[PDB]
Design an enzyme around this catalytic site. Structure first.
Site, short mmCIF file in Angstrom:
data_model
loop_
_atom_site.label_atom_id
_atom_site.label_comp_id
_atom_site.label_asym_id
_atom_site.label_seq_id
_atom_site.Cartn_x
_atom_site.Cartn_y
_atom_site.Cartn_z
N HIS A 67 0.81 -1.21 0.00
CA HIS A 67 0.00 0.00 0.00
C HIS A 67 0.86 1.28 0.00
CE1 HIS A 67 0.25 -0.56 4.55
NE2 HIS A 67 0.31 0.76 4.56
N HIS A 97 6.85 7.18 5.17
CA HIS A 97 6.29 6.59 3.97
C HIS A 97 5.69 7.74 3.17
CE1 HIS A 97 2.91 6.74 6.82
NE2 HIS A 97 2.25 7.06 5.73
N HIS A 99 2.46 8.95 0.23
CA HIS A 99 1.27 8.78 -0.58
C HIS A 99 1.41 9.65 -1.84
CE1 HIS A 99 -0.69 7.14 3.13
NE2 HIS A 99 0.08 8.04 3.74
N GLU A 109 -2.87 13.73 0.76
CA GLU A 109 -3.99 13.34 1.59
C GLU A 109 -4.60 14.60 2.18
OE1 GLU A 109 -2.66 9.99 4.21
OE2 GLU A 109 -3.66 8.81 2.64
N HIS A 122 4.91 11.30 5.21
CA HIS A 122 4.49 11.13 6.59
C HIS A 122 5.62 10.49 7.40
CE1 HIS A 122 0.00 11.04 5.46
NE2 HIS A 122 0.55 12.24 5.53
N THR A 201 -4.38 7.44 8.63
CA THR A 201 -5.12 7.60 7.39
C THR A 201 -5.21 6.28 6.66
OG1 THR A 201 -3.28 8.02 5.99
CG2 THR A 201 -4.32 9.98 7.13
N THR A 202 -4.66 5.23 7.29
CA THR A 202 -4.78 3.88 6.78
C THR A 202 -5.44 3.04 7.88
OG1 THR A 202 -2.58 3.41 7.53
CG2 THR A 202 -2.74 3.98 5.23
#
Ligand SMILES: NS(=O)(=O)c1cc(C(=O)O)c(Cl)cc1Cl
Ligand code: NI
Ligand SMILES: [Zn+2]
Length: 263
Positions: A67, A97, A99, A109, A122, A201-202
């Protein structure tokens, strides 16, 4: 009466729109990310500047978890910590990590006055008073994430050591030794920030995150972000599904106030 207990992802069938079914906390009042409405966001002169102490940060591994990709750190001591800003106490860096989007025009995000960035970084930290991240995860003040926007422009030199190894972790479950990476090379010049209480957020979307989102984006080259988009959500030997658009959209702010560290 009702009682509550396939894997989540970012597809039509298992994406953010659906996460509430296995993770009903998605329906709550502290969900991240949010749109940052700068007019609403109250400057709060009592927030301190953020003290980022990464002088001894010890990177360990880089991995594709299906992911995102992430860089881990030795969090057994105060080698890389956050304090000040809105935080009470010391938070130790565990991992970072990203996004990102299928195209430059989306991928972040958090949004600012409704603007999406190309990607968001993040840096995940846990509150040292709980002793480890598994205990911290259970608390409302367990975690702090430093969020950093990415826009496309000039290359980010500090990001190149990351990009140069992504070909070694193309597919889910791949990982590599990734030592001596300095996360300071990913920060922008100003550490002015917005803060609010929120969530992962996951999944599992737990409501224990103090968010610190930096005003100033870092810039990365088109070439660099293209390298992100060559990752795969799939494993080796499975059909290729490019790892893109691994961002959750803005969630309702509800009764929260976002505060700014800057006038
Ligand atoms: N997106 S996030 O909220 O920073 C976040 C993501 C993850 C993840 O690896 O999926 C983890 Cl473990 C913790 C946090 Cl706090
Ligand atoms: Ni019951
Ligand atoms: Zn994240």
């Amino acid at each position: 009466h009702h009682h509550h207990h396939h894997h989540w992802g970012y597809g039509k069938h298992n994406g953010p729109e659906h996460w509430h079914k296995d993770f009903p906390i998605a329906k709550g009042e502290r969900q991240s990310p949010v749109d940052i409405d700068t007019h609403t966001a109250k400057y709060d002169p009592s927030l301190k500047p953020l003290s980022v102490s990464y002088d001894q940060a010890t990177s360990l591994r880089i991995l594709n978890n299906g992911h995102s990709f992430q860089v881990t750190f030795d969090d057994s001591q105060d080698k890389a910590v956050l304090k000040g800003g809105p935080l009470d106490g010391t938070y130790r860096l565990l991992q970072f990590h990203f996004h990102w989007g299928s195209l430059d025009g989306q991928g972040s995000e958090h949004t600012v006055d409704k603007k999406k960035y190309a990607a968001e970084l993040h840096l995940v930290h846990w509150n040292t008073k709980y002793g480890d991240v598994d205990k911290a995860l259970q608390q409302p003040d367990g975690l702090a994430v430093l969020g950093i926007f990415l826009k496309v422009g000039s290359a980010k030199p500090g990001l190149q050591k990351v990009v140069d190894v992504l070909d070694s972790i193309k597919t889910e479950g791949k990982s590599a030794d990734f030592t001596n990476f300095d996360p300071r090379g990913l920060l922008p010049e100003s550490l002015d920030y917005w803060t609010y209480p929120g969530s992962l957020t996951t999944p599992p979307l737990a409501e224990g995150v103090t968010w610190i989102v930096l005003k100033e984006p870092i810039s990365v080259s088109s070439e660099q972000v293209l390298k992100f988009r060559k990752l795969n959500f799939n494993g080796e030997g499975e059909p290729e599904e490019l790892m893109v658009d691994n961002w959750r959209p803005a969630q309702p702010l509800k009764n929260r106030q976002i505060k700014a560290s800057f006038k």
